[PDB]
Amino acid sequence: ELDSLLGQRFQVLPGRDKMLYVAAQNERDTLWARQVLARGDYDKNARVINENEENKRISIWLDTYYPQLAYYRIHFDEPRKPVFWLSRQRNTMSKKELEVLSQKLRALMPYADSVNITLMDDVTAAGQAEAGLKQQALPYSRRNHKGGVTFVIQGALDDVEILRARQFVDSYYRTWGGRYVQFAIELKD
């Protein structure tokens, strides 16, 4: 526990399933801690997690049990108290349903004391997309789709402009996830 700590930018967290959960900040560290733990006696006492993998794991569960849920992403700034961003506008759940959801999520994350559900404003999510693209003089057309919006970047983009556009998009999805606003580049000329 403190034992695992000494083994190693990480937070080691006790789980209700008697597992030890090592929270890492990114991919490189996740693989490193896995390499390290596998070489010794904790090799099956610990599991290394990070925000990208845990979002993927919870999204698969929700795909079946809450298949129409309008959500963004779960954030792990404090890994003992993950915060699940849901859409305020597109939420269809009563207060009691959201409480049930929080409890199921907590059961799915044995290292978490609680899972707070925060209702986020779609106007903010789309407004950060709009602002980021404008910040790069990227013309775009916003095109609504079923339960989403696509910002379609448009123009005869060169090498660097495409990379800058895609780097912005990746940074956008790290915050909001890719389930509401999505992006595309239409190449012209």
Numbering used by the authors: 172 to 179, 183 to 363
Sentences from the paper on this structure:
The bacterial injectisome, or type III secretion system (T3SS), is a specialized syringe-shaped protein-export system utilized by many pathogenic Gram-negative bacteria for the injection of virulence proteins (effectors) into host cells.
It should be noted that the N-terminal RBMs of PrgH (defined in the new crystal form of PrgH170–392 reported here) and EscJ do not form the conserved oligomerization interface and appear involved in intra-domain interactions or membrane association. No visible density was observed for these residues in the crystal form reported previously, nor in one of the two molecules in the asymmetric unit of the crystal form reported here, suggesting that these residues are flexible. For the periplasmic PrgH170–392 domain, crystallographic symmetry-related molecules in the crystal produce a dimer that exploits the same general interface as the 24-mer biological assembly. Collectively, the crystallographic packing interfaces we observe support and mirror the low energy interfaces generated in our modelled basal body. This would be consistent with a model whereby the soluble domains have low-affinity interaction surfaces for oligomerization, which can be captured by the high concentration in the crystallization experiment. All the reported purified domains of the T3SS basal body are monomeric in solution, showing that the membrane-embedded domains and/or the presence of additional proteins are necessary for their oligomerization.
